Design a protein around this ligand. Structure first.
Ligand SMILES: CC1=C(/C=C/C(C)=C/C=C/C(C)=C/C=C/C=C(C)/C=C/C=C(C)/C=C/C2=C(C)C(=O)CCC2(C)C)C(C)(C)CCC1=O
Ligand SMILES: CC1=C(/C=C/C(C)=C/C=C/C(C)=C/C=C/C=C(C)/C=C/C=C(C)/C=C/C2=C(C)C(=O)CCC2(C)C)C(C)(C)CCC1=O
Lengths: 309, 309
């Protein structure tokens, strides 16, 4: 009667941008000094693109205390803390970082990055050489389209720190809510998944799922059950713009229904500056609830028009 | 024996950018809808220049709660709150805003501005007309050099709300502190004023002043006494870059000494993107303490080379 394991293979010819996890794996072999410098360089040719729209919502007071403690350190001390983070070293600061949600980690580095650009905290050593391995990883990153580039950078940041404040979640006022249109799809479960995402209405959204329903983010394991999925929505999924374009519906065994939708997604971290090409792969129960949805980062815009079996 | 009143006229041929307070005065006559739209337009052609370097230091948790409350409002409700702020209306939100320090007010509008650019909060009405008066004020703003433009915008923002959380102040580590060089000036009181400013070392800095010493910001009244001046330093003066260039020293009556220094200042809100041309006008006591310093926004770069009586 379909498992999460079996559901995650629906629409198998959806070609994903698996260069992204490949490059992350290459990055995770580098030494910490290589990792910091590589991101800095990759940051120098897209850092002015980040926006503050994702902040003001992740609440940073306690993290900012640590940021100011770093700001008071000598450049040798600041360098060591950043290496501790990259190495996932077991230190108090690195444990604190590792406890943070993804948006707080990103805001932490975003602020430190601006402080570095203004000399307020330690820049990357002027005459420091990217190792041969690191130079090749950087070159690979520079060759990716922006949506894949920012995904690599986010995942690299989020994984730092030693692995062991709740964000304010705000549903949009009804008068401003939009309704998507999807060429070839009118199933309200799919339309309302998109619309409640876009309105941050996660309490309505989570009711579209089966009790054991699962959601699989790009290049991640499935998140299983309403509690975990809702937790993921509130922690990470605020102020996305989901812009689906088209989709197809296929019968599935046992009264299930599988739907593929392609389109574009914008993250509040970059706004309209970066449109990532995505696919949503749904498996709906006989009661038309979401038992499984996978969200794929597509290999290229050509995949937006790939709706064949 | 010199008063603050008499001291503020030293070096009188220092030509200031008094177009800045003139344009602020014109702005303060406009209706609230005109004020919001005018800033938005003026913001559209310099908004991507603002940086986050001034945040993470003004601590915004409590202000951000109000920002999220605004984010939840209908566009009609959000519009009214912003008009209340511009009109300095006596409302709870506008009283809260009016109680904030300058950097918190600026961060509040900075975040709302990004949210507006992404549709998260109410944009300016598409078919709204700047009145004839407002169109002329906007044109005047657009014609100013960047340093004067950002000064107009800051003062306009700071004055909103109904007039009735402490920032983390971080002195630079000694190993990173820089020393200015000023062509024609070696008086340590002047050099160390600049150096302690640049290191956020306000407790050392304030000791350079006489007990009754006064500081006059651009187009402001003098701030009088160590307590008030130190308060101003900690609330507003973190992470400036003072880049003095040259200066002159003149004897003054009663064993006093008057010094003029010209150069450039950068604010963390824009980093190196905006260099404001400034003059510092010091009156030093016989004990070589700062009895008075005025900081002038100069009319044009030509004034950097104006050291004549
Ligand atoms: C680290 C470092 C730096 C700092 C560097 C910095 C500041 C780096 C920061 C980089 C940032 C801000 C990266 C943000 C990436 C966000 C992405 C890819 C969002 C994707 C969301 C998607 C696809 C949504 C998907 C969704 C859809 C549609 C659903 O349907 C369901 C939900 C779901 C979520 C799945 C320095 C520069 C300081 C140098 C030193 C150093 O080391
Ligand atoms: C409002 C509004 C918007 C928002 C607009 C926004 C976000 C506007 C934000 C504008 C910003 C961030 C303006 C910042 C200006 C800072 C300056 C001029 C610093 C000067 C410091 C100096 C000269 C230092 C001087 C110093 C020296 C050297 C000393 O020696 C001693 C100390 C002293 C301090 C004197 C929207 C876009 C949302 C539209 C709606 C709407 O209404």
């Amino acid at each position: 009667s379909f498992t999460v394991d079996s559901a995650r293979g629906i629409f198998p010819n959806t070609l994903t941008a698996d260069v992204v996890p490949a490059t992350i794996a290459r990055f995770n072999q580098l030494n910490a000094e290589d990792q910091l410098a590589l991101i800095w360089f990759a940051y120098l040719e897209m850092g002015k693109t980040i926006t503050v729209a994702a902040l003001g919502a992740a609440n940073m007071q306690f993290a900012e205390i640590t940021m100011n403690q770093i700001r008071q350190m000598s450049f040798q001390e600041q360098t060591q803390v950043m290496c501790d983070l990259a190495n996932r070293t077991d230190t108090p600061i690195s444990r604190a970082y590792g406890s943070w949600t993804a948006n707080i980690k990103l805001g932490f580095w975003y602020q430190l990055g601006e402080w570095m650009a203004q000399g307020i905290v330690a820049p990357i050593p002027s005459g420091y050489k990217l190792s041969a391995n690191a130079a090749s990883v950087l070159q690979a990153i520079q060759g990716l389209e922006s949506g894949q580039q920012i995904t690599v950078l986010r995942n690299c940041v989020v994984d730092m720190g030693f692995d062991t404040s709740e964000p304010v979640v705000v549903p949009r006022d009804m008068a401003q809510r939009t309704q998507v249109t999807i060429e070839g799809i009118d199933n309200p479960t799919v339309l309302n998944y998109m619309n409640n995402m876009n309105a941050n209405d996660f309490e309505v959204l989570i009711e579209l799922f089966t009790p054991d329903g699962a959601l699989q983010p790009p290049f991640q394991k499935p998140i299983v059950g309403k509690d975990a999925v809702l937790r993921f929505f509130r922690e990470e999924c605020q102020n996305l713009k989901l812009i689906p374009e088209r989709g197809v519906t296929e019968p599935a065994d046992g009264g299930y229904t599988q739907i593929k939708v392609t389109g574009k997604v914008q993250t509040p971290w970059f706004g309209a500056g970066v449109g990532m090409n995505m696919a949503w792969r749904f498996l709906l129960s006989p009661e038309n609830k979401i038992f499984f949805v996978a969200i794929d980062l597509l290999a290229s815009p050509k995949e937006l028009l790939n709706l064949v079996r």
